[PDB]
Amino acid sequence: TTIVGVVYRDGVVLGADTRATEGSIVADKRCRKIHYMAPNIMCCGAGTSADTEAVTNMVSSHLALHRLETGKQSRVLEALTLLKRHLYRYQGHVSAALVLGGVDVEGPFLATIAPHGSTDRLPFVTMGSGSIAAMAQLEAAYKDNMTCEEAKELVASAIRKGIFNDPYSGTQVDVCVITKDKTELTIGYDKPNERMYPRQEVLLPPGTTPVLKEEIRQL
Amino acid sequence: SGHDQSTDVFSAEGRVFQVEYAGKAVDNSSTAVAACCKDGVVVAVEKVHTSRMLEKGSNNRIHAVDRQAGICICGLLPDGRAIVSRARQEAENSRDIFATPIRGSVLANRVGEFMHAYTTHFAYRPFGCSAIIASYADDGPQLFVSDPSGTVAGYYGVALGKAKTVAKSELEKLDFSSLTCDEAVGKLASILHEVHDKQKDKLYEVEVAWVCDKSDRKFVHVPADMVP
Amino acid sequence: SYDRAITVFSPDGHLFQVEYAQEAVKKGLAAVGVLGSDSVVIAVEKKSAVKLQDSRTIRKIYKVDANIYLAFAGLSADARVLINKAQLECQRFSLNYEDTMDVDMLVRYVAGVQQKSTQSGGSRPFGVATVIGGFNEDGKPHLWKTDPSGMCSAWRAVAIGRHDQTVIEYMEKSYKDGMSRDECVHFAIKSLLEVVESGSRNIELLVLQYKEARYLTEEELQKFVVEVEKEREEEAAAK
Amino acid sequence: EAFYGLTTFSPSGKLIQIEYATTAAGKGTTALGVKATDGVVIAAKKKAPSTLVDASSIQKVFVLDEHVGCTYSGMGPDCRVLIDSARKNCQQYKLMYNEPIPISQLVRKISAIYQEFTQSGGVRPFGCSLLVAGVDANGYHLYQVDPSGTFWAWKATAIGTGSPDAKAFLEKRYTVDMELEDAVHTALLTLKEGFDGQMTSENTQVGRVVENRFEILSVDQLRDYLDQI
Amino acid sequence: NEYDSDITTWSPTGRLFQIEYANEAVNNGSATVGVKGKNFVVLAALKRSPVAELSSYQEKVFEIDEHVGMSISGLVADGRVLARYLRTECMNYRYMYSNGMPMNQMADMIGEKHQRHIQCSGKRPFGVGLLLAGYDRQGPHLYQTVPSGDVYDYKATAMGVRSQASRTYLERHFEHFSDCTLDELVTHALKALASATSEGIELNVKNTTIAIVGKDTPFTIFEEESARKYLDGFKMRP
Amino acid sequence: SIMAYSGGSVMAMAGKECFVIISDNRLGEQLKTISTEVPKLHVVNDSIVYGLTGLRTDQQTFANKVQFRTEMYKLREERDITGKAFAAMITSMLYEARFGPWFVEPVIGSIDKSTGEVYLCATDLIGAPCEPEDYVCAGTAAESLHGMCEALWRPGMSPEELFEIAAQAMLSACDRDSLSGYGAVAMIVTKDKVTTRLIKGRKD
Amino acid sequence: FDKYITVFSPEGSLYQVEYAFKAVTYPGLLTVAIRCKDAVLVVTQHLIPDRLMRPDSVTALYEVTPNIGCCMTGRAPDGRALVQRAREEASDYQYRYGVEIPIAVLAKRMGDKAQVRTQQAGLRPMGVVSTFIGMDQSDQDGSLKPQIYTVDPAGWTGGHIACAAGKKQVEAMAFLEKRQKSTELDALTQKEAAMIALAALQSAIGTAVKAKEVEVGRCTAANPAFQRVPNSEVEEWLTAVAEA
Amino acid sequence: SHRYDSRTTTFSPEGRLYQVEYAVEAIQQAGTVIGVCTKDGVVLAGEKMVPHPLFDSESMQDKNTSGEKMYKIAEHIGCSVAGVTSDAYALLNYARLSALRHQYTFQEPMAIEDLCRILCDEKQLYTQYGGVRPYGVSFLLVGWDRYYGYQLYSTEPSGDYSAWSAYAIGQNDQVAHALLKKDWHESMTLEDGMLLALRVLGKTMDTAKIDLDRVEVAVMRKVPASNIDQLLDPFKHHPKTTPRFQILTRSELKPHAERADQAREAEEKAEAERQR
């Protein structure tokens, strides 16, 4: 996994590869690693997929419940604190590494939550296996007060570094643009790895595979 | 009949009769008197002895809660000692947890919160004592009175017990900006000797304690020579 | 949990809640136990053959273990809980000691459970008297009664439920020590007939012998009831 | 620390404390619901004690989740318990099944809580009726839950003070054809019958279930509808 | 009286009746007496007097540690409950500090323990009075504990039935107890106790326990052969 | 490995308005084969079929726990559970045991009866859902199945075509796995009908 | 039987709650909160009859958090008890979510606490009307706006423009309601709003107040922290009231 | 607080549990339910609350698991309730779980008497422990098992239950028991038991014709089993006939209701000829 966030002038861009892996094998080429937390908060996940899924769902639910109590858009600090406290409790055994991007009234807020429940609130972050490759692009090309386009392009560039140079990262760049007003999740913002060689359709006509018994049931 | 059986029950008038009735136990108890000066604070309590054969210091109504603070109990002494024991628990949590002598205002609120807790629940009864909290922690000399209801209030001077009314008349004659702890020990003890019923309660002594600059801001019984 | 004291002493030394659990047992259907030489017979009255109750046979004498059977009097619901408790204890006992639990052992367990209900805060007593018959593995027959107080006694013949004291006063006049399987069954029915309706259909009765529990069929039974009701006519003529 | 039951059977067989709680639920201000072909509208009047109450801080209609919302009659503070629990249940259901809770299943879970408080020790029943309105796979739904725990699916109903007159009025006006914009009209006309003084966006709240979502009408949206009645 | 049923009910006059009633248990208990001198405390208790040639024994006096013991009046069951508590707390203390629980500290513990019972609904006041008698660094201590949770540091006291007669005797003589020997204290304890006896019955080994504690003397209960030294040659003369 | 102990592989495959789910038939203890007639498929309802791979104990325990939950759902909810909800329910159940997990890897095939849109979801033992467009697999022959399914699978396949490539995948992958085979039970789920086919494979 | 436990009467009412409302009035003290354009005030009658009572010590106003102040009307010690619950609730919230508890959430959570004691037997209602005041950040633009939230013994929680609780609350409301027809009341300056609040106090108790006989809490957009207003600044408002 | 304890779980001086006696009196206020157990199946016919024109259906996908009066407990166990509907729902959920907990453990359907016993052990608890009111609900459990076949159980708030050939709970339970005693016989088709149940329902609620709007009918019966799926567990035996609880629609009930109308009509022509 390589997941990336930058703060730009109007909001946050999150970025993620799409390759899920069972060991050395790609289980899903186009899996979604940018999770809805709240209307104004998204959360890219690396580490243990099960844990990232469970922790991110658990919190998004608590934020939603809390949003009915307050009548108030969820603050990215509330999200951050719920994840920290949960992850800390489990001493990193819940191995979710997260990039929490959002835009509350206090402005753009981008943070990592490490599995042990550390936080770093920073203007650009990376997590996952391709974090270091991605971060190299970010350190090289990040400036303050980027346009939305500059920021999306940079995030895609950063993810591509993971895609091409990390084996656990791959396929396409999903990008998410959280602004004050709205959250635009672009799936396959960049698809650098389309189709080399069109799939040779091996034709196995019906009755090819020998069948001992057959039960048909109509509905 | 059922309006006043437990403290968990408001009456129609909006009051908690079991707490008023606990209050009555304090108003029928031995008189206590106290004075907050610049120098520190002084507590004097009349102990009505049932028997000629008690030791000196029997049924002490005044107890050190911490170095800087002491509770004098006007009311049922045993109930009072449960509050003393709690006030101690709070005083030692301040030093154990927060590394500070508990402030008087804090210690008083903590004593009141405790006494109030017992006014809210059917299973418990109100305390039968008003605690007089004397302290000289970092918030200066402070004198407070938690009553059975849990109501805390700060005082310059204060009388509790069966001579509450007359002892207060005599406390109002004192100027509190002016008087020292050394005068107060005299005047407070004098007040308790004056208001005492000679024919009703033959056997009695006046237990006085203070916490002042003199005593190193340490809450102690005053020596027997000052007491008269 | 709710642990208010329900069973408490009254000024005269009575546990009213236990005296009322016994009032529930007096209202309960009569059951009867008769110990013989080689047999225990438990006979109970049924509420009477309503056309609607399932034709399929439901037994009002409950089996606690292979060796041990019990009839009860009082609250059906409470009895079902005791019997399930006894049933479990017998199996808890085979688990913990290879041996099958003796009747006298189980009776004391069941009587202990009934006593606990008279001293547990939060519970009323069980409104149940019990007649527990059976044979110890050795071969000795046992007949016991358990009343709601949790006090249990062994009997040669016993009755619980409605008109228990009428049946017991009647039994102790006519009861003979050594009795045949047939004489016990005769005596049990004769005894139940003192209080139960003249009808043969209400009585249902179980005959325990060492390793052999058999309920009388309503064909087997009506032979004995005819033979008994002609003997109750003989005793009506004498008086 | 009280564990004995407060709700017990009378000799007649009635649970007197549930009858009395149902009296408590009838005593609240009028709320009402109207199911349509393409949605449902729930409207309550939020008559404030004085003009000094921040009307916007009063909440008579609640969101339980994106797709379901309720109003209530009777003891406000009691309802806040049911609404907080119902909100928990919608979220617990989403966490499990990654799906909006059917209104069927939400109402049953609220019913269960009403029932706990009719039987569990040391607690009295809730003194509030809910109207729950939402949308699931089975379509649009309007349920009334009562202090008993009993719930009914309704086409249209009312709870609170003028509810016998507001039910009578809805029975005449209601048709199966009734669409959402016509139902919102009908709901507000029903409130207006029992109402004393003019209706305003400050005076009434209106939830509506439309498409696949529940929303509370903003004061701007409510003014558009109050101009027409 | 609608206010005398529960411990948690204050009367309107500010009395706790269940405590006043638990006090009546103590006043109907058999008489015990305590006198303390310079170096010694003497408990003397009336046992039940043998009916014809038929004896009863009931443990009314308890050693609690080397340096402390107890004489109860009232519900002997509740005496036993305090005896176990005080024994347990004295052992704990001695385990920690390798020295006897100081008596002022012990007096405060019983007081506290009584008080836990006079405020909760579930509990009830102890229907027993104690005479704690102890010796520590601060010298001899005699406490009378009472169901209310009050604890009285006494020079001398009595407890139980016709004990107002004992306290009358003690009031004539108690000023001279710090000057008395051990043998004069025990005379005084018995002379006080013998005021509490009914009509014509005299003190003797079969109807009177004596217990002593003091300087270099661990808490000892004298019955039979041990008590005879004080009780054979004892008569009460006006 | 505790997961490879009992043997068995399962695979599911998405076609046009249909899916095929196919399990091998072997039950083992490491290399000793107990049975050759233990398919790993379970039918929740018309529209959902799942396989469980992993430790047979847990396949059987977990399958019971699921049968409890799906039948309770059916009574409470008064409807069949959907593939999405069923999958979500199964991740919830597996993640309930994050620390002390069920040694199962469920493969879920489902189809929306109206829309005809197919939902596959493989899961790891702690609930991590994998929800691809094409195919999912699990069990001892999973490395080899991925290879076969990647090669043979196309997007918009008819049920009959889809069955053939799933059968050829399951058989060819199981022929390179010691711990899976003795043919396969496949199950071809459509909106209209559910075909079930026992497939002749090796005895090896 | 209806009147001593927390069960419905035949007319669907909880008598013990109706009686805890009587406890609010019993002490004979009146509080008035008012919300202006950029501030909240809360004015509490602060009567010490005893010349020997230390005025500084007896407070109806408590800080719940730096940014939420409270004013408790009714049984002082019940008030003190609810403050401790509010402070617990606020502390707990700040820890769980990493932000100060919003006043409207705190109020609601204190309503939930009160409701529990109306539904569970054997817990006495806290016979006190809690009046939380504080700024609340608007999520639309980030501007702070002033808030009053009352919680009563029933559990009923409400936002207010102005509110009174205590002895002559019906008469103080009547005055504020009459003054709301003239002016906007949310377009007012802190000075103008303070005068209305103090004038409602003065009207209701039926006597002119000294600056000593009231304690005044305050939260402003500029200084959102809950401050006690010094006697000097209150003296200027009472001279400003007695003139106009 | 002990002062205000109602003492629900105590005997009275006559040895009776008043809270149970009164809960029974709450079930005699409830809607009449008739159970008729035949050789072909069991029939529940119940009296629904008079339908207000604004009553809506919950548009539930599966029509045969719940109605107003009838609830499926498991594939082979159904029930009707008379009494506190909210208590019924609590206990219905408990029954559903117990039947499934049994199926979890044994992987076979729970015997009807076993469920009835578990459901009634739960009701008994609340008459002995816990100082709260009993469940004010009586069940008619119907169901099929391999042990005793088609079964009908009544269930009482006390906890005691009884097996019945035919029975009634609710409003006119005594009047119904009389009319079932007369007309129930051991050799009865489902159609003939459907007829009985509706004639007795019709006669208890004093209607000339059976009012389709006010009656629900459920039928526990065995049907041919279709979804075998034999290839998925080769060794699992699937029975030919599986039990199926069905709640009749308005259209499904109308011919059975018109036949109970015609049988009442023909019996009223006999009452005209008896007088002649």
Report the Cα B99 to chain-centroid distance in Å.
Answer: 26
- Tokens for D226? 């109050």
Query: Residues in chain A, how many?
Result: 219
CB atoms within 10 A of CB H267: 11
3-state DSSP percent of chain H in helix, strand and coil, to 5: 35, 25, 40
CB atoms near residue C139 (< 10 Å): 9
Compute the CA torsion angle A55, A61, A62, A64 (nearest 10 deg). 140
DSSP H37: E
Residue position matching structure tokens 């025990």: E186
Check if the beta carbon of residue B190 is closer than 8 Å to that of residue B31.
no
- Residue A147 falls in which region: left (phi positive, over 0), alpha (psi -120 to 50) or beta: beta
| H or E stretch at H105 | helix H85-106
**Top-level class of domain A1-219:** alpha beta
Q: How far is CA B19 from the centre of its chain?
A: 17
Are there at least 3 beta-carbon pairs closer than 8 Å between A and G?
A: yes
Number of Cβ pairs < 8 A linking chain A and chain G: 34
> Which structure tokens are listed for F53?
């791979």
Are F82 and H107 in contact by the 8 Å Cβ rule? The answer is: no
Residue G110 near residue G82, CB atoms below 8 Å: yes
Residue H267: in which H helix or E strand, if any? Answer: helix H250-275
Q: How far apart are CA A135 and CA D199, in angstroms?
A: 59
Q: Which residue of B has its CA nearest to E118?
A: B79
CB distance from H160 to chain C under 8 Å?
A: yes
User: Does F127 contact A25 at a Cβ distance shorter than 8 Å?
Assistant: no
* Residues of A with Cβ-Cβ distance to F111 under 8 angstroms: none
Q: How many domains does chain E have?
A: 1
- Residue to test with chain H: of D3, D6, D8, D141, most H Cβ within 10 A: D8
User: What is the strand order of the sheet A34-38 is part of?
Assistant: A34-38, A41-47, A96-104, A107-113, A119-121
Q: Measuring CA to CA, which residue among B83, B86, B91, B41 is closest to residue B66? A: B91
Question: Using H for helix, E for strand and C for coil, what is the string for chain C?
Answer: CCCCCCCCECCCCCEHHHHHHHHHHHHCCCEEEEECCCEEEEEEECCCCCCCECCCCCCCCEECCCCEEEEEEECHHHHHHHHHHHHHHHHHHHHHCCCCCCHHHHHHHHHHHHHHHCCCCCECCCCEEEEEEEECCCCCEEEEEECCCCCEEECCEEEECCCHHHHHHHHHHHCCCCCCHHHHHHHHHHHHCCCCCCCCCCEEEEEEECCEEEECCHHHHHHHHHHHHHHHHHHHHHC
Amino acid at C64: V
CB proximity H167 to C under 8 Å: yes
Query: Mind telling me how many Å the CA of G11 is from chain D's nearest CA?
Result: 7
- The closest of E87, E79, E37, E84 to E61, measured between CA atoms, is E79
Residue A193 CA, chain-centre distance (Å), reads: 19
Nearest CA of chain G to the CA of A6: how many Å? 23
Closest CB from F77, F84, F88 relative to D102: F77
Tokens of G101: 């508890």
Query: What is the C-alpha separation between E204 and B134, in angstroms, rounded?
Result: 54
Range of the domain at F99: 1-204
Alpha-carbon distance H16 to A108, whole Å? Answer: 71
Helical residues (DSSP H) of D58-132, grouped into ranges:
76-97, 103-119
| Region of residue A5 (left: phi > 0; alpha: psi -120 to 50; beta: else) | beta
Beta bridge partners of residue C160, listed in sequence order: C31
Q: Where are the domains of chain A?
A: 1-219
**Structure-block tokens of residue G177:** 């309601």
> Residue H201, SS3?
helix
What CATH number does the domain containing F169 carry?
3.60.20.10
Q: Order of strands across the sheet with D61-65?
A: D61-65, D68-74, D128-136, D139-145, D151-153
The answer to whether G139 and A72 have CB atoms below 8 angstroms apart is: yes
Please, what is the Cα angle at G207 between G201 and G213, to 5 degrees? 65
CA C150 to CA C115: how far, in whole Å?
4
DSSP single-letter state for residue D51: T
DSSP assignment string, B136-150: EETTEEEEEEE-TT-
Cα H246 from Cα A170, distance rounded (Å) = 54
Six-digit token string for H173: 């339970």
For residue A187 the two structure tokens come to: 């799936």
Q: How far apart are CA E146 and CA D32, in angstroms?
A: 66
Question: Backbone phi, then psi, for A154, in 5-degree steps?
Answer: -60, -50
**CATH architecture of the region C1-239:** 4-Layer Sandwich (3.60)
Q: Does A68 touch chain F (CB under 8 A)?
A: no
| Tokens standing for residue A92 | 């990193």
The helix (H) or strand (E) run that includes residue G43 is strand G39-45
By annotation, the residues of A acting in catalysis are 1
Residue C81: closest CA among C101, C100, C62, C59: C62
Amino acid at C39: S
Q: Are B6 and H1 in contact, with CB atoms under 8 Å apart? A: yes
CB-count burial class (<10 Å; 0-12, 13-18, 19+) for B228: exposed
- Per-residue CA distances from A104 to A39, A151, A177, C182 (Å): 10, 19, 14, 93
Q: What are phi and psi of A165, to 5 degrees?
A: -110, -15
- How many CB pairs (< 8 A) connect A and F? 102
Cα(G41)–Cα(G36) distance, integer angstroms:
8
* Longest CA span, chain H: 70
Contact D108 F89 (CB under 8 A): no
Would you mind telling me the total number of residues written for chain F in this entry? 204
Residue G66 CA to residue A91 CA, distance in Å, equals 33
Q: Are G41 and G227 in contact (CB under 8 A)?
A: no
The count of other CB atoms within 10 Å of the CB of residue E51 is 8
φ/ψ of H139, rounded to 5, equals: -105, 145
* G98 with A81: Cβ contact below 8 A: yes
DSSP 8-state code for residue D125: P
For A195-219, b/e burial (b = at least 16 CB within 10 A) is eeeeeeeeeeeeeebeeeeeeeeee
Interface contact flag, G119 D117, Cβ < 8 Å = yes
Residues 6 or more apart whose CB falls under 8 angstroms from that of H272 comprise none
The residue assigned the tokens 């309770």 is F72
SS3 A32: coil
The token pair at A100 is 């929490």
CB D3, CB H8: distance < 8 Å: no
Distance, CA of H224 to CA of F81 (rounded, Å): 24
- G120 and chain H in contact, CB less than 8 A: no
Min distance A70 CA to chain D CA atoms (Å): 11
Looking up residue D186, the CATH number of its domain turns out to be 3.60.20.10
Cβ contacts (< 8 Å) between B53 and chain E: which residues? 154-157, 167, 170-171, 174
User: What residues of chain G lie within 8 A of the CB of D14, using their CB?
Assistant: none
Q: What distance in Å separates the CA atoms of residue C59 and residue C62, rounded to the nearest whole number?
A: 7
User: Do A81 and G139 make contact, defined as CB atoms within 8 angstroms?
Assistant: no
PDB experimental method: cryo-EM
CA nearest neighbour of D1 among G8, B122, B7? B122
Terminal Cα distance for chain A, rounded: 43
Type and span of the H or E element at B192: helix B181-195
For residue G230 the two structure tokens come to 């010094």
Residue type, G58: V
Q: Alpha helix (H) ranges present in A20-147?
A: 49-70, 76-89, 131-141
Structure-token pair, residue D4:
């004995």
- Structural domains for chain B: 1-228 (3.60.20.10)
* Alpha carbon separation from H183 to A205, C51, D163, H36 (Å, rounded): 66, 10, 46, 11
Q: How many residues does chain B have?
A: 228
- Residues E67 and E235 sit within 8 Å (Cβ to Cβ): no
Q: Which residue is it, tokens 């609830």? A: H71
Q: Residue C105 to residues C61, C99, C136: CA-CA distances in angstroms?
A: 19, 12, 10
Please answer whether residues B162 and B27 qualify as being in contact, where contact means their C-beta atoms are separated by less than 8 angstroms. Answer: yes
CA distance H203 to H195: 12
CB contact under 8 A, D57 and G160: yes
Cβ atoms of C35 and C156 within 8 Å: the answer is: yes
Q: How far is CA F195 from CA B11, E29, F198, G190, in A?
A: 76, 92, 10, 79
Residue A97 in contact with residue A114, Cβ under 8 Å? Answer: yes
Residues of G numbered 171-230 whose beta carbons fall under 8 angstroms of chain B's beta carbons: which are they? none
Q: How far is CA B155 from CA B36, B129, B149, D131, in A?
A: 7, 17, 17, 55
Largest CA distance in chain E: 54
Rounded Cα–Cα distance for residues B99 and E187 (Å): 55
Residue appearing with tokens 């799409």? A18
Output the CA torsion sign for E127, E131, E134, E138: positive
Distances (CA, A) of E27 to B58, E163, E196, F87, G180: 21, 8, 12, 76, 71
CA distance B167 to H251: 92
- In angstroms, the CA C61 to CA C71 distance is 5
Identity at B206, one-letter amino acid code: V
Residue in F with minimal Cα distance to H72: F75
**Which of D23, D77, D123 shows the shortest C-beta gap to G120?**
D123
Interface contact flag, F127 A22, Cβ < 8 Å: no
User: Which contiguous run of DSSP H or E holds residue F90?
Assistant: helix F83-95
Residues 6+ positions from H252 with CB-CB distance below 8 Å: none
* Domain residue ranges of chain C, discontinuous segments joined by +: 1-239
> Hey, is the C-beta of G121 within 8 angstroms of any chain H C-beta?
yes
Task: Please check whether residue D52 touches B, CB under 8 A.
Answer: no
Alpha carbon separation from C142 to C113, C198, F46 (Å, rounded): 20, 29, 60
G-chain residues near B133 (CB < 8 A): none
Phi and psi torsions of F103, nearest 5°? -80, 70
**Touching partners of D (3+ C-beta pairs < 8 Å):** A, B, C, F, G, H
Residues of G at the D interface, defined by Cβ within 8 angstroms: 5-14, 35, 104, 108, 111-112, 114-115, 118-122, 148-149, 154-163, 173, 176-177, 180
Cα–Cα distance measured from residue H135 to residue H91, given in angstroms and rounded to the nearest whole number: 8
Interface with G, mutate which of A69, A76, A113, A119 (most G CBs under 10 A): A69
Domains of chain H are: 2-275 (3.60.20.10)
Do the chains contact at C122 and H162, CB–CB below 8 Å? no
CB contact under 8 A, D13 and H25: yes
Round to whole Å and give the CA distance between G34 and A33: 50
Region at D48 (left for phi over 0; alpha for psi -120 to 50; beta for the rest): beta
Instruction: Calculate the dihedral angle through the C-alpha atoms of A127, A128, A134, A136, rounding to the nearest 10 degrees.
Output: 70
The letter for the amino acid at G72 is: M
* Contact predicate D148/D29, CB 8 Å: no
Whole-angstrom distance, CA of residue C80 vs CA of residue C58: 14
Domains of chain G: 1-244 (3.60.20.10)
What is the Cα–Cα distance from E29 to E21, expressed in whole angstroms? 13
Q: At F42, which amino acid appears?
A: H
CA C5-C9-C14 angle, 5° bins? 135
Edge-to-edge strands, sheet with E151-154: E61-65, E68-74, E128-136, E139-145, E151-154
- In chain H, which residues have their Cβ closer than 8 Å to the Cβ of G4? 3-4
Which residues have a Cβ under 8 Å from the Cβ of F51 and sit 6 or more positions away?
Answer: F10, F11, F12, F21, F23, F40, F41, F42, F106, F107, F138
Pairing, β G61-65 against β G68-74: antiparallel
Domain count, chain D: 1
Q: Which of D123, D134, D103 is nearest to D7 (CA)?
A: D123
Beta carbons within 10 angstroms of residue C99's beta carbon: 11
Domain with D142, as residue range(s), is 1-229
Instruction: Round the CA-based radius of gyration of chain G to a whole number and report it.
Output: 18
Q: Which of H29, H54, H130 sits opposite D154 (nearest CB)?
A: H54
Report the distance separating Cα E226 and Cα G59, nearest Å. Answer: 68
- Residues G173 and G167: beta-carbon distance below 8 Å: no
DSSP string, D133-197: EEEETTEEEEEEE-TTS-EEEBSEEEESTTHHHHHHHHHHH--SS--HHHHHHHHHHHHHHH-SS
Could you tell me if D80 lies within 8 Å of chain G, comparing CB atoms? Answer: yes
Name which of D70, D86, D87, D67 is nearest D136 in CA terms. D67
First to last CA, chain F: 21
C-alpha span between E51 and E49 (Å, rounded): 6
Quick check: helix, strand or coil at residue F58?
Answer: helix
Q: What is the DSSP letter of H3?
A: G
Among candidate residues H66, F86, F121, H70, the one with its CA nearest the CA of residue D138: H66
Chain B residues within an 8 Å CB radius of H3: 2, 5
- Choose among C156, C158, C172: nearest CA to C130: C158
Taking alpha carbons only, the member of E171, E22, E42 closest to residue B50 is E171
- Total structural domains in chain F? 1
d(CA G130, CA G217) in angstroms, rounded, equals: 14
The two tokens of residue E185 are 């204290």
**Helices H173-183, H190-204: inter-axial angle, 10-degree rounding:** 140
For tokens 């409830």, the residue is: H30
Which residues in chain A have Cβ-Cβ distances shorter than 8 Å to H231? 213, 215
Interface check for A210 against chain F (CB to CB < 8 A): the answer is yes
Contact D176, D189 (CB under 8 A): no
The beta-strand segments (E) located in chain B are 32-36, 40-48, 62-64, 69-75, 129-137, 140-146, 152-154, 157-160, 204-212, 220-221
Domain containing E222 equals 1-238
Grouping H, G, I as helix, E, B as strand and the rest as coil, residue E98 is coil
Exposure letters B55-87 (e unless 16+ CB within 10 A, then b): eeebbbbbbbbbbbbbbbbbbbbbbbbbbbbbb
